[PDB]
């Protein structure tokens, strides 16, 4: 999964032509490791249909501040430049797929 930061956010996320799923994580976050596999898998499965990125809050806090993200793991969904939904915690693959499906 491609990393996204403060400098590529507008381009990669806000100007995307397809729905975007963003995974907010950090090296010290334990539960984050549990969803990492699920994120990579979904990115592959929906290639060409959605864009997936991961944002390390340690290196791009500016974005976390913009959307008022205060806890991780957090998964955000964007579509046409707008934040459509926020999910906190170790989300199961099935729940993420339900969301991906509604934005398609």
Curated annotation (Swiss-Prot):
Record domain Thioredoxin: where: 1-104
Disulfide pattern: 29-32
Domain of life per record: Eukaryota
Active site, renumbered: 29, 32
Site (Contributes to redox potential value): 30-31
Sites marked Deprotonates C-terminal active site Cys: 23
Protein name, per record: Thioredoxin M-type Md
Species of provenance: Spinacia oleracea (Spinach)
Origin organism lineage: Eukaryota, Viridiplantae, Streptophyta, Embryophyta, Tracheophyta
Shown segment, full-protein numbering: 76 to 179 of 181
């Amino acid at each position: 999964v491609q990393d996204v930061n403060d400098s590529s956010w507008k381009e990669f996320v806000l100007e995307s032509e397809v729905p975007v799923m963003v995974d907010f994580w950090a090296p010290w976050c334990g539960p984050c490791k549990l969803i990492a596999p699920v994120i990579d898998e979904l990115a592959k499965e929906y290639s060409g249909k959605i864009a997936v990125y991961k944002l390390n809050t340690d290196e791009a806090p500016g974005i976390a501040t913009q959307y008022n993200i205060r806890s991780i793991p957090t998964v955000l969904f964007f579509k046409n430049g707008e934040r459509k939904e926020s999910i906190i915690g170790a989300v199961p693959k099935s729940t993420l797929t339900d969301s991906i499906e509604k934005y398609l």
